[PDB]
């Protein structure tokens, strides 16, 4: 077997050391724009998010309302694919034709929306999603280092060329990144075992500390860019517990962040608002739980504290990210990724 | 004294990083067959388990019923030797003559069964076990790095040559492995202080994290194979807390796994089913406890939650191992041992 | 991004290993004098504290009474700047004209006092503080690695040359130290995220273990001294939980220590003494809490156990520091910084 | 300041890896004899303990009864010196003239006894202790790296030459060992901050993990032996929590072990047996507590569970040490120190 020289680490084991803050760096001047799909050196991505946040491909998170609320703030949602093809396509259609400053829209001013797909019924699901107006797709899986994903992306390329965008994953190392890169993925998702609803050491024992995963994948992505001239955006998926973890994820190189629990707490999540013993909560369950996979166990069902509407919470979260970015001397995500000083902290200090 | 460069680690400190999963790797096609006794390069072992699990040499685990239930699923039990020679032999006889898809049997279609022996009364115990039809023997001890085990194996070779198989142990490093290898052991057991009923730092303070122990012994076993052409199967004994620890143990190189607590929870364990305050439990005590050694203290007595019949639980456990194996791109244990990517995780992440 | 080879550590992760204690080293002969502002090689600082302790630039700590009580024992207070310019100047005036063995005074025998300033209204605040008789100033900020601090210090130099002393900070590495050094700071404060009222991983996630921060800054300060002949005193700000942390901070190279919580517990702190359920406590809130910044959240409000008058507590604390210094063979802070043997301890031992 | 490459570790962070156990190694044949005072290469120590245990120089541990009970089993007690010279000498006299298989006695068959001394009144205390019949003395201090100890040992040599034996300490590194060695100490005690009644990080913050301390001192002692031909026995003082820590301490190189809490639990300790809420306990306080030093605070007062008479407990403890020694292939302490395989374990495994 193959072993590693260092153990993996989570976001909580890191802190950012401030850099030179110049007079021009104030929150309001920080640009959080970021690329969603791959492009060549010298080019710009065909799709750029206004904010680096995307909602998870989960039944309990990304419904039509979430997609609209998030797109309005500049991010994008990936309508869950764990439902009928007709049902998912309807949600995409609804978002695209809802209108019939930081909003994320297409050339027709329609909100952008993404849709998750699987490696099984894609031949019938993809065409339906495309027809419905899906702007981007993403294969939804915990282990994306699979020949099945290569096959799915291949079918999409043969049928649509580079006209249809498709993200792939999840993977946690350079090899996994490289495989999906050569297979043609437009963006690659990072993360196995870091999700809030994931108790890896109770499931199959696969995974890697999210921080180490991102750092390793990002290094491979940059090496890949230098060899081929192709820049593939990467997504840090799961493990975001505090707002500063967002800044860390981006600083380590992730172009954008996928969150489930964070967004489930909002009014716009498709789940029921349940007042439990004085405290308002919201339902939240993983895609691996029986409560969802049937559309030993493989998931968990829980509650998250109600946080109100998405808007106010995202604004608050991003204000802190912008502020921290200025402490690090960065006005943009690329500048933060270049200038960030990231230190590991001792277990005792935690 | 001699010191080491790195501290030892337990199975809980590791996770498997996925490799390339091909279209042909699905649970039902995974082969969990594995060698039980030594053979030369180019050969196959005279005894191959259908599943890599064996029940512990304990009064509270491996009785006649356990041996039959486990052999039916492809594994093998080691009837405890902490009882009279006549009593142990009777259990072996019963298993061998019980019949008078994955079942483990001999050329006469009789279930395979093993028997534990000690370094004291083996001159009278071994012949009785052989006559009773024991398929394999195993010296039962916490510290197998002993001249006593060399003597016992030697007596067996002089009297039966290589016709009678005998495992030895336990040891935790290359030196211990090497000593029992040269002494003639057919398989070597790994593990001191990792058992669930073992509070080393309350006993004699001897031991080593199970993971480090396996990794070190496996490296020595492979070095030994390359020097002599002799492949000696090794057994990871104790410390299995979760199903994924099984996959880890195998991935690190262990050919099979010995479990006590895991099997004690089943209907077939020779202990009493005790309903305690609404919850059904089963008795479980170590071979070092006074409740067993008399056939300061040196053991513990406890209860384990009832899990029902062995069959359903083993099937469930092995389905997860097979699934994880496919995530790692492996259709067989040898392929998993060759391709596994194993990472240590930080203490904080735990 | 830039990463580090070692994780950062807090004061609690260190212990001092005794050195040779000579017959002349007894507590009463230990000299705790220390420089407050920069000087050139061969010179002495224009301002030397009698004891290496200074009270924090906080509304809940450094008021007029604190400043007088601390100056009487040899230390100095930095009147908080989070109040009106007129209000802060009045406190400075009161301390300077209060008299109208270890006391810290000027050539006119008036108690020394410091005053915090900000990077915004300094053009009006500084002149008022100077006129009021402030002996030293200090820019109050969590992230001193800012062009804003360079601008503030520059304005002070152009208007007063080196006649007005101004400390800057906070920073946590050599780069941050170097920037404020070249900018002209008279002393530099070390520390981000180590304060007792700081939950970094709930704010912006910036910071560094206080110990590592001091050690790193001190190395840069000594390198700087060797290149330019300029010795800049550094202050370890925050994170002092036990008296021995004081000895550690000094041993690692800090010239003096800034404390908030430690001093808040005293009768002289400007807060209310609140008897809560039998125990007398004192109010303590951070400068980032809403309860103070308005003169999502950015601070905490709490209570600290009443410790009585400053005098008896400081004497007790410093007696232990002096005693420990003799164990390390040191009669002065510079000798301790030169001879200290500092070891990291394992997480398990904690 | 000076820093170290590795953090210090306690005994709990180590485990012994078994070595080859030969047929002749059984508990009853294990020899636990060990040297108490220094000798030259090729020689034997003038005083050899039958068992490597000595009771602490504490009012709550080593009284006349303890000294007799321990000497009867082969160890020796150091009558506490924190009492009047007349009072301490009386206890020594009583032990020496109490008679007016493993017993530790002199050529006149009188029990051996030790006595603690301080660096202040030794000119009057030593002669009184010698006259009373003290077999060995030991300077009692937490920081033995002192010119005061050099002075005390020097006075003893000038007045008695090498006729009076005197141990010194405590120290925790090679430098401290070396200083007391050159000063003439007959044995050196190791340990600062490891005692059970020591909360270092609440006192002065001085110390070092006991394990690292012993390992480091032992290396220096062996280097010293090779340079000068003088072998100085070293004592691991404090930190023994479990019986196996004894085996560890010896394996790491300590010739003998000093224990306080361990012996306080016995009927023979000079403290009161207090039945508290059904459980019989014994008083135990440190020499630094006010309850003893007057013959801020510097010690703790507590209770230890009653263990009965010393004899049965020591026999039990040493049987486990002997058994563990055989697992390591050692029949004597020197052989264990030479053959022991010692591994550090991960924090997670603890
Ligand atoms: O049932 C599940 N088990 C484990 N991970 C899951 C499950 N469902 C979703 N996830 C992952 O967890 C992410 C959400 O992480 P969270 O933001 O920490 O809640 C998703 O985007 C998925 O990648
Ligand atoms: O009394 C005992 N003390 C320590 N280890 C024991 C004892 N009895 C059995 N064992 C070991 O523990 C293993 C079982 O580990 P478990 O599966 O974690 O319960 C056995 O196969 C033995 O090697
Ligand atoms: O609101 C706050 N948040 C974080 N740090 C603060 C705040 N107010 C003051 N500080 C810092 O904490 C120090 C006090 O640390 P303490 O002595 O551990 O209580 C101050 O000198 C500041 O540098
Ligand atoms: O008051 C005290 N504070 C700290 N250490 C002490 C005190 N009194 C005795 N000791 C040390 O603690 C040892 C006992 O350690 P114990 O066996 O762990 O209880 C003694 O031999 C001394 O070296
Ligand atoms: K900055
Ligand atoms: K895979
Ligand atoms: K000293
Ligand atoms: K052995």
mmCIF file with all atom_site columns, C-alpha atoms in Angstrom, chain A residues 238-307:
data_model
loop_
_atom_site.group_PDB
_atom_site.id
_atom_site.type_symbol
_atom_site.label_atom_id
_atom_site.label_alt_id
_atom_site.label_comp_id
_atom_site.label_asym_id
_atom_site.label_entity_id
_atom_site.label_seq_id
_atom_site.pdbx_PDB_ins_code
_atom_site.Cartn_x
_atom_site.Cartn_y
_atom_site.Cartn_z
_atom_site.occupancy
_atom_site.B_iso_or_equiv
_atom_site.pdbx_formal_charge
_atom_site.auth_seq_id
_atom_site.auth_comp_id
_atom_site.auth_asym_id
_atom_site.auth_atom_id
_atom_site.pdbx_PDB_model_num
ATOM 1  C CA . UNK A 1 238 ? -18.452 20.386 2.792  1.00 0.00 ? 238 UNK A CA 1
ATOM 2  C CA . UNK A 1 239 ? -16.840 20.931 6.154  1.00 0.00 ? 239 UNK A CA 1
ATOM 3  C CA . UNK A 1 240 ? -17.644 24.638 6.449  1.00 0.00 ? 240 UNK A CA 1
ATOM 4  C CA . UNK A 1 241 ? -18.463 25.171 10.124 1.00 0.00 ? 241 UNK A CA 1
ATOM 5  C CA . UNK A 1 242 ? -17.548 28.853 10.618 1.00 0.00 ? 242 UNK A CA 1
ATOM 6  C CA . UNK A 1 243 ? -17.496 31.847 8.279  1.00 0.00 ? 243 UNK A CA 1
ATOM 7  C CA . UNK A 1 244 ? -13.703 32.032 8.436  1.00 0.00 ? 244 UNK A CA 1
ATOM 8  C CA . UNK A 1 245 ? -13.497 28.507 7.019  1.00 0.00 ? 245 UNK A CA 1
ATOM 9  C CA . UNK A 1 246 ? -14.805 30.096 3.813  1.00 0.00 ? 246 UNK A CA 1
ATOM 10 C CA . UNK A 1 247 ? -11.843 32.486 3.733  1.00 0.00 ? 247 UNK A CA 1
ATOM 11 C CA . UNK A 1 248 ? -9.505  29.566 4.475  1.00 0.00 ? 248 UNK A CA 1
ATOM 12 C CA . UNK A 1 249 ? -10.945 27.373 1.700  1.00 0.00 ? 249 UNK A CA 1
ATOM 13 C CA . UNK A 1 250 ? -10.599 30.178 -0.835 1.00 0.00 ? 250 UNK A CA 1
ATOM 14 C CA . UNK A 1 251 ? -7.111  31.116 0.416  1.00 0.00 ? 251 UNK A CA 1
ATOM 15 C CA . UNK A 1 252 ? -5.971  27.531 0.021  1.00 0.00 ? 252 UNK A CA 1
ATOM 16 C CA . UNK A 1 253 ? -6.965  27.720 -3.644 1.00 0.00 ? 253 UNK A CA 1
ATOM 17 C CA . UNK A 1 254 ? -10.584 26.638 -3.965 1.00 0.00 ? 254 UNK A CA 1
ATOM 18 C CA . UNK A 1 255 ? -12.394 28.833 -6.506 1.00 0.00 ? 255 UNK A CA 1
ATOM 19 C CA . UNK A 1 256 ? -15.770 28.330 -4.865 1.00 0.00 ? 256 UNK A CA 1
ATOM 20 C CA . UNK A 1 257 ? -17.455 26.569 -1.963 1.00 0.00 ? 257 UNK A CA 1
ATOM 21 C CA . UNK A 1 258 ? -20.358 24.127 -1.850 1.00 0.00 ? 258 UNK A CA 1
ATOM 22 C CA . UNK A 1 259 ? -22.431 24.215 1.336  1.00 0.00 ? 259 UNK A CA 1
ATOM 23 C CA . UNK A 1 260 ? -25.348 22.156 2.579  1.00 0.00 ? 260 UNK A CA 1
ATOM 24 C CA . UNK A 1 261 ? -26.000 22.780 6.268  1.00 0.00 ? 261 UNK A CA 1
ATOM 25 C CA . UNK A 1 262 ? -25.214 26.505 5.928  1.00 0.00 ? 262 UNK A CA 1
ATOM 26 C CA . UNK A 1 263 ? -28.051 26.990 3.421  1.00 0.00 ? 263 UNK A CA 1
ATOM 27 C CA . UNK A 1 264 ? -30.472 24.469 4.985  1.00 0.00 ? 264 UNK A CA 1
ATOM 28 C CA . UNK A 1 265 ? -30.957 26.894 7.894  1.00 0.00 ? 265 UNK A CA 1
ATOM 29 C CA . UNK A 1 266 ? -32.602 29.456 5.616  1.00 0.00 ? 266 UNK A CA 1
ATOM 30 C CA . UNK A 1 267 ? -36.279 30.160 4.994  1.00 0.00 ? 267 UNK A CA 1
ATOM 31 C CA . UNK A 1 268 ? -35.732 29.300 1.336  1.00 0.00 ? 268 UNK A CA 1
ATOM 32 C CA . UNK A 1 269 ? -34.574 25.711 1.910  1.00 0.00 ? 269 UNK A CA 1
ATOM 33 C CA . UNK A 1 270 ? -37.316 23.254 0.709  1.00 0.00 ? 270 UNK A CA 1
ATOM 34 C CA . UNK A 1 271 ? -37.673 21.686 4.150  1.00 0.00 ? 271 UNK A CA 1
ATOM 35 C CA . UNK A 1 272 ? -40.174 22.173 6.950  1.00 0.00 ? 272 UNK A CA 1
ATOM 36 C CA . UNK A 1 273 ? -39.680 24.796 9.638  1.00 0.00 ? 273 UNK A CA 1
ATOM 37 C CA . UNK A 1 274 ? -40.163 22.960 12.934 1.00 0.00 ? 274 UNK A CA 1
ATOM 38 C CA . UNK A 1 275 ? -40.516 24.797 16.249 1.00 0.00 ? 275 UNK A CA 1
ATOM 39 C CA . UNK A 1 276 ? -38.971 22.401 18.768 1.00 0.00 ? 276 UNK A CA 1
ATOM 40 C CA . UNK A 1 277 ? -39.280 23.282 22.457 1.00 0.00 ? 277 UNK A CA 1
ATOM 41 C CA . UNK A 1 278 ? -39.140 27.048 21.935 1.00 0.00 ? 278 UNK A CA 1
ATOM 42 C CA . UNK A 1 279 ? -36.451 26.988 19.234 1.00 0.00 ? 279 UNK A CA 1
ATOM 43 C CA . UNK A 1 280 ? -37.257 27.118 15.533 1.00 0.00 ? 280 UNK A CA 1
ATOM 44 C CA . UNK A 1 281 ? -35.324 24.501 13.561 1.00 0.00 ? 281 UNK A CA 1
ATOM 45 C CA . UNK A 1 282 ? -35.224 23.216 9.984  1.00 0.00 ? 282 UNK A CA 1
ATOM 46 C CA . UNK A 1 283 ? -34.995 19.650 8.735  1.00 0.00 ? 283 UNK A CA 1
ATOM 47 C CA . UNK A 1 284 ? -31.714 18.490 7.261  1.00 0.00 ? 284 UNK A CA 1
ATOM 48 C CA . UNK A 1 285 ? -30.818 15.028 6.039  1.00 0.00 ? 285 UNK A CA 1
ATOM 49 C CA . UNK A 1 286 ? -28.047 13.665 3.841  1.00 0.00 ? 286 UNK A CA 1
ATOM 50 C CA . UNK A 1 287 ? -28.426 12.207 0.350  1.00 0.00 ? 287 UNK A CA 1
ATOM 51 C CA . UNK A 1 288 ? -27.144 8.925  1.751  1.00 0.00 ? 288 UNK A CA 1
ATOM 52 C CA . UNK A 1 289 ? -29.858 8.584  4.391  1.00 0.00 ? 289 UNK A CA 1
ATOM 53 C CA . UNK A 1 290 ? -32.702 6.145  3.712  1.00 0.00 ? 290 UNK A CA 1
ATOM 54 C CA . UNK A 1 291 ? -35.069 9.103  3.953  1.00 0.00 ? 291 UNK A CA 1
ATOM 55 C CA . UNK A 1 292 ? -33.779 10.072 0.506  1.00 0.00 ? 292 UNK A CA 1
ATOM 56 C CA . UNK A 1 293 ? -31.823 7.346  -1.298 1.00 0.00 ? 293 UNK A CA 1
ATOM 57 C CA . UNK A 1 294 ? -34.831 5.036  -1.692 1.00 0.00 ? 294 UNK A CA 1
ATOM 58 C CA . UNK A 1 295 ? -36.373 7.318  -4.350 1.00 0.00 ? 295 UNK A CA 1
ATOM 59 C CA . UNK A 1 296 ? -27.335 -1.068 7.942  1.00 0.00 ? 296 UNK A CA 1
ATOM 60 C CA . UNK A 1 297 ? -27.654 2.615  7.039  1.00 0.00 ? 297 UNK A CA 1
ATOM 61 C CA . UNK A 1 298 ? -25.742 5.195  5.020  1.00 0.00 ? 298 UNK A CA 1
ATOM 62 C CA . UNK A 1 299 ? -26.843 8.591  6.306  1.00 0.00 ? 299 UNK A CA 1
ATOM 63 C CA . UNK A 1 300 ? -28.220 10.824 9.051  1.00 0.00 ? 300 UNK A CA 1
ATOM 64 C CA . UNK A 1 301 ? -31.378 12.890 9.648  1.00 0.00 ? 301 UNK A CA 1
ATOM 65 C CA . UNK A 1 302 ? -31.226 16.016 11.815 1.00 0.00 ? 302 UNK A CA 1
ATOM 66 C CA . UNK A 1 303 ? -32.251 19.593 12.576 1.00 0.00 ? 303 UNK A CA 1
ATOM 67 C CA . UNK A 1 304 ? -30.479 22.925 12.059 1.00 0.00 ? 304 UNK A CA 1
ATOM 68 C CA . UNK A 1 305 ? -31.267 26.218 13.823 1.00 0.00 ? 305 UNK A CA 1
ATOM 69 C CA . UNK A 1 306 ? -33.435 28.581 11.780 1.00 0.00 ? 306 UNK A CA 1
ATOM 70 C CA . UNK A 1 307 ? -31.399 31.543 10.554 1.00 0.00 ? 307 UNK A CA 1
#
